[PDB]
Amino acid sequence: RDTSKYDPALLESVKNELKQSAALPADNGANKTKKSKPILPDWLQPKFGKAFQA
Amino acid sequence: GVLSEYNQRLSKKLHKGHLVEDKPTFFVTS
Amino acid sequence: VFNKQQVEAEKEAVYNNALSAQNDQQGLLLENIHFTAYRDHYFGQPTHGIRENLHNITDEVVKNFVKTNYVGSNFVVAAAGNVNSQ
């Protein structure tokens, strides 16, 4: 059943709300935080100085 | 005084006897 | 000389350094113990500073900081190695 007795604005709003109600939310892949890449502390690493061995 | 605590504390802003925030609050650690 | 454009350029680098501070797990945990040990003092705040405030620094703030803090009584110059004392 349908007819023009319903205001076009009302029909558009109803259709949009019906579409949005069943829409499954999806991730946009934005506003991401940096991923940690830990490295060994300085005291667990060789000292800066290095010369020609032999 | 010994009983002054009760008298002083009587003047408090608390929701139904519970000391709660009056609005949403958010704390972050830098 | 601290130019506004230079500060604008370095804002991104400082923010990236603040975010990457987590790479050194021991250092970040040291900053966390400083934060938890001194909650009623600015001494607890992380050395890299608050992230959201990093973009708020201007040239004038840096100039005032260096002018009011880098004073003669605060400077100690130490020398070692093959250096002529006189």
Added chain:
Amino acid sequence: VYGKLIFNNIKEYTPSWIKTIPYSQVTKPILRKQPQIVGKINADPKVKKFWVFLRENVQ
């Protein structure tokens, strides 16, 4: 109260559609020392010395 059930198809721990407050709203700490809430009896220096003695001789 938040909304529809979200299954494991969302890879990120924090879905994008959630709301994150700006830095303006978050309350700032009061990084100043505040007056001590202490009664008359314990404010007496002799009582403080007694507490220290008990701490460092018997406790």
